[PDB]
Symmetry: C2
Subunit: 118 residues, 2 copies
């Protein structure tokens, strides 16, 4: 069902965030892009999202806050400086995925998001 799923994208790079939103639209998803993690966290309180993908320096504390407050929301952490240490932490904090940036492709990223909502 078209527009039945809404995705929040916390992403500083507006061009990239636009490309992901357009890709998600292809599969019938609604998506909001924000460059601000504080904005994103607030949005989750006033709108109902099914999934959030966050790229931010302080992503990990955010993961835990959302997992506690909004337990059924799928959380994907994406990082331009991926490390083994941060991957382990993200999963231990309850993230549903950890994705290195840059992405393989918009289509591959969308397929993964699709799967995470399956």
């Amino acid at each position: 069902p078209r527009g039945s799923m809404r995705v929040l994208l916390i992403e500083k790079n507006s061009v990239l965030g636009g490309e992901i939103e357009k890709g998600l639209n292809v599969k019938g998803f609604m998506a909001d892009v924000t460059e601000s993690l504080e904005d994103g966290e607030y949005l989750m309180d006033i709108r109902n999202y099914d999934l959030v993908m966050v790229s931010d320096k302080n992503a990990l504390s955010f993961v835990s806050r959302i997992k506690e407050k909004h337990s059924s929301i799928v959380v994907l952490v994406s990082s331009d400086n991926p490390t083994s240490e941060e991957e382990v932490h993200a999963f231990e904090q309850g993230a549903d995925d950890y994705i290195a940036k840059p992405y393989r492709s918009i289509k591959a990223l969308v397929a993964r998001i699709e799967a995470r909502l399956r």
Copy 2:
């Protein structure tokens, strides 16, 4: 609970497969390594696994066969030649994850497997 989860690893590289088994053992998981996809598929019929990770050229048809026969088993596809096209296909075929080789680390791979069984 120790040994309550069993993982099948289809992996041609015996040294790498050993390293993953040892890593999984750290978290209380049992793991069987096989270098043969036909062997692995057969094992799934005679033993009860919770998760299979497969690196093989013919992984994608296998994904669909297992998803149809053994629907609750988590399936992770790992590839030494990752492409956008094959990632999309793996997810569309019902894989729970698609992981590029080489791995970030054994600990990061184990954390991901842990999460996929959560």
